[PDB]
Amino acid sequence: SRITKFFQEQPLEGYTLFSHRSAPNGFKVAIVLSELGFHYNTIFLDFNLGEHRAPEFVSVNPNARVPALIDHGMDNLSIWESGAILLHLVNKYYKETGNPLLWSDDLADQSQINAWLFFQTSGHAPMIGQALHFRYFHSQKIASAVERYTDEVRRVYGVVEMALAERREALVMELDDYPVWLVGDKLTIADLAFVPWNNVVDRIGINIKIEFPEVYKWTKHMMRRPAVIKALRG
C-alpha cells in the first residue's frame, strides 16, 4: 500500500508517471514529458507483487495497467492510456505556450497525427505484444500463432516504410540526407509513439535495419535526440 500515502500528500505541480521498469508505452510518456520540458516523478510498479491491483491505483486507472499519469497542477488528474497521455501533454503544452511542439495547430495535421497515433496504439503495440507472448510466455509453443503476429507486425512496418518512402521521395524532389516525418514534415507524438516498440521487435525476429530501411533511418533520428536518450535510460 506504499501508493497510499502518495495520494494524501500529492505535489502542487509537476507530474508523476506510473510505469514498469521496461514497459515500452511507459517509455512513450517519459519521452514526450522530457521532450516538452515537464518535470516528473516515476513510480515503477512491481507487477510480480501485484502493485497494479492495489485499490489506490485502480482508482488511477480502472484497467490496472501502465502507464498512468497524474497531472498534479490539474488537481491530480489521472490520464491512463498512453495515447490519451500524449494528447493531454501536447494539448497542455500548446495551451500554455502557443507553440504546437510535437503537435500541430492545424486541424488537418491533428487528425493525421491521431490517425498514426491510433494506428500505433491499436495496430502496432498490441500485435508486437502478442508476438511476444506466443514466442516466450504462452503455455504452449504454437508456430502459427507466432507467425500470425510477426507477419502482422511486419505488415504494419510495411505501412510505415511505404509512408516514409513517400515523404522521402517528395523531399528528394527538392533538387536545386534529411529526417522525414509522418506528419507535416515535423516531429510529432505520432513519430515518437513507435520508437520504444521499434527498439523491441528484434526480440520477435524482426531486424528493422535490413527489413525496413526508411524506418531504420526514421527511428535512428529519434534515438539520437537527447530528450529521447535521457528518458530511455531504463
Add this chain to the structure above:
Amino acid sequence: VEYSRITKFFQEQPLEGYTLFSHRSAPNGFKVAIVLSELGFHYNTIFLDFNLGEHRAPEFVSVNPNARVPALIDHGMDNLSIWESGAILLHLVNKYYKETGNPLLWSDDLADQSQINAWLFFQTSGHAPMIGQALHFRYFHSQKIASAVERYTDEVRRVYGVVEMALAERREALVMELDTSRFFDYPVWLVGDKLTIADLAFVPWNNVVDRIGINIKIEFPEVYKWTKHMMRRPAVIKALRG
C-alpha cells in the same frame, strides 16, 4: 481483383460533405457511422469489396496507408482523409465544436477531454483488438488452439469488467445524490454525466461479443443498461441500419 469503381470515385469526389469507406462486418466501421449520425453530418458510405481487392486500389491506399476500414474523407476540407476509427471520432467532435460552439459528445474542458480519450484509446487498443483475436482463434485460424481462444475470451471479459466497474462507480455516485433506489436504471455515462464518443465507441462491439460466448445482460448489468439507452437513440438506430 477489380477496383474500377474505387478509382473512379477519387476522380470525381464531391465538393464538400463526407464519404465513409466501411464494410458490413466491421464494428469500427459502424462506430464512425453512429458518431457521424449523432452529430448531424451527412455522408455516403462505400462498402469496400475486399473479395474484389478494392482496398488495394492505389488511390485508396494513397489516402489510407493501412488499407483497412473505416476511413473517412472530409471533402469540405480538401478531401482530407482520416483513417483510424479513433482519429475519426476526435476529428468529428472537434469539427462540430469549432463550428457550433457546443461540445456535443465531446467536452470543452481539457480534463474531460483527457478522460474521454482515455476511454477511447482503451476501447480501440485494449477492447476492439482483443475481441478481434478471440473471434479469430474461435472461427478463423488455420488450426484449433484452445489456449488461444481461452486467452482472449478472458481478456475480453476482463476489460468488460473494467467498464462494468467504472459504470458501477458512476452508479453509486449519482445514486448517492438523490436518496439522501428509483434511479437504479437512470442513464449513466463514462465521463461528464453526458453521452460522449467514449460511451458510443463500445456499442458496435458490445453487440458482437455474443459470438465468443459473452452474455452482457447476464454477465455485465451496467453495460447492459448502458448499451440499451444508446441503442434507443434515433441517430444510433439510423446508423446500424444504414
